[PDB]
Amino acid sequence: CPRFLKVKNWETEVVLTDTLHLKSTLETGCTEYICMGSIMHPDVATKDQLFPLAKEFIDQYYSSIKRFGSKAHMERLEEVNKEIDTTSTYQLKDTELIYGAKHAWRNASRCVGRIQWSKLQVFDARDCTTAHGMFNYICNHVKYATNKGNLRSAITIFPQRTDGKHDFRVWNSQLIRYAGYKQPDGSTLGDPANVQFTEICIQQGWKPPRGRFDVLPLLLQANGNDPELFQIPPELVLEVPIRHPKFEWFKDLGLKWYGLPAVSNMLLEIGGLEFSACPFSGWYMGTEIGVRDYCDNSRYNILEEVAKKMNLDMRKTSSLWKDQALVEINIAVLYSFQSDKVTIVDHHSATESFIKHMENEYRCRGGCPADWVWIVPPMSGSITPVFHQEMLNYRLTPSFEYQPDPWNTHVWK
Amino acid sequence: RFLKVKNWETEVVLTDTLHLKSTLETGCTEYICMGSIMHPATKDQLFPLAKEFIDQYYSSIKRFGSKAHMERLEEVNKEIDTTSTYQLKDTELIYGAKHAWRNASRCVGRIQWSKLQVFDARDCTTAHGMFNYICNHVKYATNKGNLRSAITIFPQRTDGKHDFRVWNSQLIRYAGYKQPDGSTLGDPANVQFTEICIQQGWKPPRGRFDVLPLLLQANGNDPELFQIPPELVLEVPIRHPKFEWFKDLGLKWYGLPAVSNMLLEIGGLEFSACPFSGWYMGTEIGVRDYCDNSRYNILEEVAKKMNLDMRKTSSLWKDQALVEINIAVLYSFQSDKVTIVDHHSATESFIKHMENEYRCRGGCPADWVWIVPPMSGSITPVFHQEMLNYRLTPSFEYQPDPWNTHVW
Ligand code: HEM
Ligand code: HEM
Ligand SMILES: Nc1ccc2ccc(CNCCCc3cncc(F)c3)cc2n1
Ligand SMILES: Nc1ccc2ccc(CNCCCc3cncc(F)c3)cc2n1
Ligand SMILES: C[C@H](O)[C@H](O)[C@H]1CNc2nc(N)[nH]c(=O)c2N1
Ligand SMILES: C[C@H](O)[C@H](O)[C@H]1CNc2nc(N)[nH]c(=O)c2N1
Ligand SMILES: [Zn+2]
């Protein structure tokens, strides 16, 4: 691979030089003959697979603290090596755990919010042994991160994988999501995205209220055991009623959303160690709710209803009635969050911050891996600066990874 | 292997086998994706390329290994062997041009690919000849508002010093002028080209929408200036169906998008001059040409007239102005009965096209970065469509600006 790759911004003429890509650790899925950049997704480590993975991370950590090659560096390498030799795994120091989590975020090529990567509260939950304990840790995370609306980014890290039959998993895809209910007539109530999971919860004993915005219970698996249900204390779940500054009728649509986006089904990989339960949270970019959650045809799908209330000509597509209503819905989401003083960022501010972030990273780090397909917001693409910015996508470690859904793999006891 | 692409909204899964045909590189490697990077002969090189193309031509008319096929291979072979090049048959030229369109991964309009009027201009020898051919192209393709896709193909490259080139990036474009006060009048994209026309003798009206003259290079000679007869230049005054003040912005655009700076490659042969044209998807003008900061950059002016609050970005005043502008462009073209397609209709057809291509051809190379419209991405079906990008020949390729290589 060439040592220096250039990226250009076509609106500002700024050229950046990437050297960081040489540190790339795994496959994108592309080859020299095909690009899979728009494909969404293109038994434990042996002792021999683990050794170089840990060394690579340890070196990286000690290089970051300006102690590379020090006595403490070499001692730590020695102690890790002996641990792997005698136990076939190793345990991270708290310093290393914190460094690794922050860097997994810093490395997440699909995240537009990474300017914030160094301000991450890390909660070490590696002493957790039961599902009740996972619930306690999760409740504390939710309360801290919510902070009465002044949201603070955070991650809670549960014990790492051992033999793969004792995994800790949060079965929820996010800590807070709304239920979906398939009706006998084919219609869906609530969020169609969560139908499968909702069904699982109901089978496990959950009594469904069967409303349009029912917060799902936690389904929590500890140490490879069967998962257990828990209700999050409603006072810990901050929600925002969606209204519009001009359209008095908008509140009558009865929409609302939850304040805290908290992804809980990803796998955190550090120095070859696998943390299968690592729920993390930041705050929302408005479009995630106003465009995707609300306007996707396979989601709440509200465009028509809003358009009819806006008295739009909906007979031709070329009236852009869909686009017109889409903007108003997004205005409503930002207005409603700001008004209730719940942190949220619009797609202009967020993409402008990311450009500055990217430039700084190129300067101090020699690059910034970025997935343009994900970074460009789902509305108004080209009137945000990221649209015009060439990006290189590659995979650095530590990293957040996808993992199979737990009900697909769980061995029921 | 076989590659699956999934649409996440419809759950439809397609299987790509067509990609096994590509031999050209994408730029990505196993470890680094360059999906958002805008831009990542000899006898010995020539024949296998010629043979490849002749082979797929005869496979497409279902006469592979036929007497005609065999004879054509030997004929081309002899001709390369004796002249360092060869000439395509008319049938092959047409097949080649339609297939370059079909293989253009960045083009959302490909459902039309087999409807392409091909104008063979390989007998052309002078810039005056080129002008005549271009005028006829524009007249044919414009068709009084009922636009028809067309391509005009000039002689292929020989030694690299006798290239035919249309120096204009599109056949019809608006000039751009650098003002004393450091601002730009007209289209800032064309400031450099405009200056070259001026330096060559073009007398600029110095307005906002001055149609540039044609600058045409035949056989490697210096380029020459020509004014396209105005009656051949269809233009649309932009107005809004609700905001009657919109026409007071004085905005207009031309009906015919005719890209003239690309290189058409067929069977190893390079056609450095091949202006082609279709019709507009509305966002090209309403989002990119009008609202790009580096282009006409009108958002702020429009937003003012709409009396929006422009203090905070989170009011989405920009997004609001963007939609109204795009509504106007579509309404104007439609009202003047000039062909145009909105991004909903276009992306819809593209999905149907993909479905067609997978069934009959085994796939469809597609560049999600280009296919997804620059506004309202996820409310169009292509946003939710996984696509595989790969390079098939015949193809349209980029080439350097003539002013950076030409000696006078
Ligand atoms: C602090 C404010 C943050 C903002 C504004 C933000 C913004 C975003 C957005 C808009 C996406 C696209 C998600 C989608 O379309 O589904 C995303 C993806 C992502 N974010 Fe961030 N984020 C933030 C914090 C975080 C944190 C704290 C982490 C981890 C510690 C993180 C890691 C990721 C990852 C791994 C993805 C890719 C998710 C996937 O592939 O499904 N983000 N972010
Ligand atoms: C007939 C109606 C057509 C429509 C609606 C259409 C639509 C589009 C659009 C919107 C783009 C993106 C352009 C940009 O953002 O700069 C594009 C790209 C492209 N189109 Fe089409 N197009 C049409 C006809 C054609 C024809 C007739 C050809 C060639 C014979 C063609 C070949 C291409 C190529 C090569 C690109 C890539 C341009 C580049 O890489 O710079 N298209 N098309
Ligand atoms: N505001 C934030 C911050 C961090 C985030 C991290 C992750 C996410 C959500 N990514 C969800 C995509 C999951 C998915 C996987 N496969 C197919 C899909 F359609 C969707 C949203 C975030 N939002
Ligand atoms: N409606 C159509 C049909 C075919 C088209 C074919 C091409 C185009 C314009 N492509 C623009 C590429 C110019 C460019 C390339 N690389 C970097 C740049 F900054 C600018 C527009 C079309 N519009
Ligand atoms: C097929 C395509 O890759 C898929 O729909 C992607 C496109 N870009 C995205 N970008 C973000 N931020 N989130 C998404 O879910 C998607 N979906
Ligand atoms: C940096 C990025 O590749 C560049 O801005 C691309 C993005 N997608 C595009 N898509 C289209 N249709 N046209 C373009 O000019 C671009 N520009
Ligand atoms: Zn790629």
Say how many CA atoms lie within 13 Å of B387 toward its Cβ. 27
- Using CA atoms, how far apart are residues A277 and B284, in angstroms rounded to an integer? 45
CATH of the domain at A110: 3.90.340.10
Instruction: Give the DSSP per-residue string, A294-348.
Output: HHSTTTT--HHHHHHHTT---S-GGG-HHHHHHHHHHHHHHHHHHHTT--EE-HH
Give backbone dihedrals phi and psi of B176, rounded to 5 degrees, phi first: -135, 140
Q: What is the dihedral of CA A342, A346, A351, A352, to 10 degrees?
A: -90
Where is the binding site, in residues of A? 38, 111, 174, 283-284, 288, 373-374, 387, 402
Of A364, A361, A338, nearest to A349 by C-alpha is: A338
> Between chains, do B25 and A33 touch, taking CB under 8 Å as contact?
yes
Based on the fold, state whether residues A47 and A122 are members of the same structural domain: yes
Give backbone dihedrals phi and psi of A287, rounded to 5 degrees, phi first: -60, -30
Q: How far is CA B227 from the centre of its chain?
A: 22
Give backbone dihedrals phi and psi of B263, rounded to 5 degrees, phi first: -115, 125
| Orientation angle between helical segments B90-102 and B43-60, nearest 10 degrees | 90
CATH of the domain at A312: 3.90.1230.10
Give backbone dihedrals phi and psi of A335, rounded to 5 degrees, phi first: -60, -40
Contacts of A299 (CB under 8 A, 6+ apart): A191, A192, A193, A292, A293
- Picking from B9, B32, B330, the nearest residue to A394 by CB comes out as B32
Q: Which residue has the tokens 């056609």?
A: B271
Given B92, B265, B284, B357, which residue is catalytic? B284
- Using CA atoms, how far apart are residues B327 and B34, in angstroms rounded to an integer? 34
- Using CA atoms, how far apart are residues A286 and A334, in angstroms rounded to an integer? 6
A48-70 burial by CB neighbour count: b if 16+ within 10 A, else e?
Answer: eebbebbbebbbbbbeeeeeeee
Cβ neighbours around B163 below 10 Å, total: 25
Give backbone dihedrals phi and psi of A180, rounded to 5 degrees, phi first: -120, 145
CA-based torsion, B268, B272, B275, B281: positive or negative = positive
Cβ neighbours around B161 below 10 Å, total: 10
- Picking from B282, B291, B368, the nearest residue to A37 by CB comes out as B368
Q: Which helix (H) or strand (E) holds A79?
A: helix A71-87
DSSP-assigned letter for residue A202:
H
> Between chains, do A387 and B377 touch, taking CB under 8 Å as contact?
no
Question: Where does residue B365 fall: left (phi above 0), alpha (psi -120 to 50 degrees), or beta otherwise?
Answer: beta
Going from the C-alpha of A191 to that of each of A197, A214, A216, A264, B173, the distances in angstroms are 11, 9, 11, 18, 48
Residues on chain B touching A348 (C-beta within 8 angstroms)? 313-314, 318
Q: Which residue has the tokens 């789902």?
A: A378
DSSP-assigned letter for residue A101:
H
**B51 within 8 A of B45, measured Cβ to Cβ:** no
Of B261, B331, B321, nearest to B296 by C-alpha is: B321
Cα A39 to ligand 5 centroid, rounded to whole Å: 9
Based on the fold, state whether residues A71 and A157 are members of the same structural domain: yes
Q: Which helix (H) or strand (E) holds A370?
A: none
- Using CA atoms, how far apart are residues B342 and B346, in angstroms rounded to an integer? 6
**A50 within 8 A of A89, measured Cβ to Cβ:** yes
Environment class of residue B275 by beta-carbon count within 10 Å: exposed (0-12), middle (13-18) or buried (19+)? buried
Q: How far is CA A253 from the centre of its chain?
A: 29
Give backbone dihedrals phi and psi of B191, rounded to 5 degrees, phi first: -55, -45
Based on the fold, state whether residues B329 and B354 are members of the same structural domain: no
Of A107, A99, A117, A116, nearest to A21 by C-alpha is: A107
How is residue B379 written in tokens?
């409310």
Residues β-bridged to residue A218: A230
- Using CA atoms, how far apart are residues A90 and A85, in angstroms rounded to an integer? 9
Based on the fold, state whether residues A106 and A138 are members of the same structural domain: no
**A291 within 8 A of A379, measured Cβ to Cβ:** yes
Q: What is the CA radius of gyration of chain A?
A: 23
In this structure, which residues have their CB less than 5 angstroms from ion ligand 7? A 30, 35, 37; B 28, 33, 35
Maximum pairwise Cα distance, chain A: 74
Instruction: Give the DSSP per-residue string, B316-360.
Output: -HHHHHHHHHHHHHHHHHHHTT--EE-HHHHHHHHHHHHHHHHHH
How is residue A196 written in tokens?
């499968």
Based on the fold, state whether residues B296 and B272 are members of the same structural domain: no
The data reach a resolution, in angstroms, of: 2.0
Q: Which residue has the tokens 């106003």?
A: A290
**B208 within 8 A of B162, measured Cβ to Cβ:** no
**A387 within 8 A of A376, measured Cβ to Cβ:** yes
- Using CA atoms, how far apart are residues A198 and A204, in angstroms rounded to an integer? 10
- Using CA atoms, how far apart are residues A127 and A142, in angstroms rounded to an integer? 19
Q: Which residue has the tokens 């390329």?
A: B49
User: Structurally, how many domains does chain B consist of?
Assistant: 3
Query: Which residue, by CA, sits nearest to atom 14 of ligand 6?
Result: B370
Of B178, B250, B172, nearest to B212 by C-alpha is: B172
**B377 within 8 A of A372, measured Cβ to Cβ:** no
Tell me how the structure was determined: X-ray
- Mutation pick for ligand 4 pocket among B107, B171, B259, B280 (CB with most ligand atoms within 8 Å): B259
- Using CA atoms, how far apart are residues B99 and B96, in angstroms rounded to an integer? 5
Cα A374 to ligand 5 centroid, rounded to whole Å: 6
Cβ neighbours around A243 below 10 Å, total: 20
Ligand 5 neighbourhood includes B209 CB (under 6 angstroms): no
> Between chains, do A322 and B6 touch, taking CB under 8 Å as contact?
no
Based on the fold, state whether residues A31 and A70 are members of the same structural domain: yes
DSSP-assigned letter for residue A92:
-
Residues on chain A touching B34 (C-beta within 8 angstroms)? 35, 392
Return the ligand 6 atom nearest residue A391 CA: 1
Please check whether residue B7 lies inside any domain of the structure: no
> Between chains, do B31 and A37 touch, taking CB under 8 Å as contact?
no
**B271 within 8 A of B264, measured Cβ to Cβ:** yes
Please check whether residue A4 lies inside any domain of the structure: no
> Between chains, do A322 and B376 touch, taking CB under 8 Å as contact?
yes
> Do the bridges between strand B395-397 and strand B263-266 make them parallel or antiparallel, or are there none, so unpaired?
antiparallel
Pick the residue from chain B with its C-alpha nearest to A7: B37
Ligand 6 neighbourhood includes B226 CB (under 6 angstroms): no
Please check whether residue A107 lies inside any domain of the structure: yes
Ligand 2 neighbourhood includes B347 CB (under 6 angstroms): no
- Using CA atoms, how far apart are residues B39 and B397, in angstroms rounded to an integer? 10
Binding pocket residue ranges, ligand 1, CB within 6 Å: A 105, 108, 110-113, 116, 120, 153, 155, 280, 282-283, 285, 288, 345, 350, 374, 400
Please check whether residue A98 lies inside any domain of the structure: yes
Based on the fold, state whether residues A24 and A158 are members of the same structural domain: yes
Ligand 2 neighbourhood includes B341 CB (under 6 angstroms): yes
- Using CA atoms, how far apart are residues A168 and A267, in angstroms rounded to an integer? 11
**A222 within 8 A of A131, measured Cβ to Cβ:** yes
Based on the fold, state whether residues A86 and A195 are members of the same structural domain: no
Based on the fold, state whether residues B178 and B311 are members of the same structural domain: no
How is residue B283 written in tokens?
């966002």
Based on the fold, state whether residues B197 and B273 are members of the same structural domain: no
Cα B276 to ligand 2 centroid, rounded to whole Å: 9
Based on the fold, state whether residues B220 and B289 are members of the same structural domain: no
Q: Which residue has the tokens 């039309």?
A: B112
Based on the fold, state whether residues B27 and B155 are members of the same structural domain: yes
How is residue B299 written in tokens?
């958002």
DSSP-assigned letter for residue B375:
S
**B334 within 8 A of A345, measured Cβ to Cβ:** no
Cα A95 to ligand 1 centroid, rounded to whole Å: 23
Going from the C-alpha of A229 to that of each of A207, A223, A236, A367, B299, the distances in angstroms are 11, 15, 17, 43, 51
- Picking from A27, A37, A326, the nearest residue to B35 by CB comes out as A37
Domain that holds residue A41: 18-126+153-163+267-281+351-375
Please check whether residue A288 lies inside any domain of the structure: yes
Measured between CA atoms, how close is B190 to chain A, in angstroms?
14
Please check whether residue B3 lies inside any domain of the structure: no
Please check whether residue A223 lies inside any domain of the structure: yes
CATH of the domain at B140: 3.90.440.10
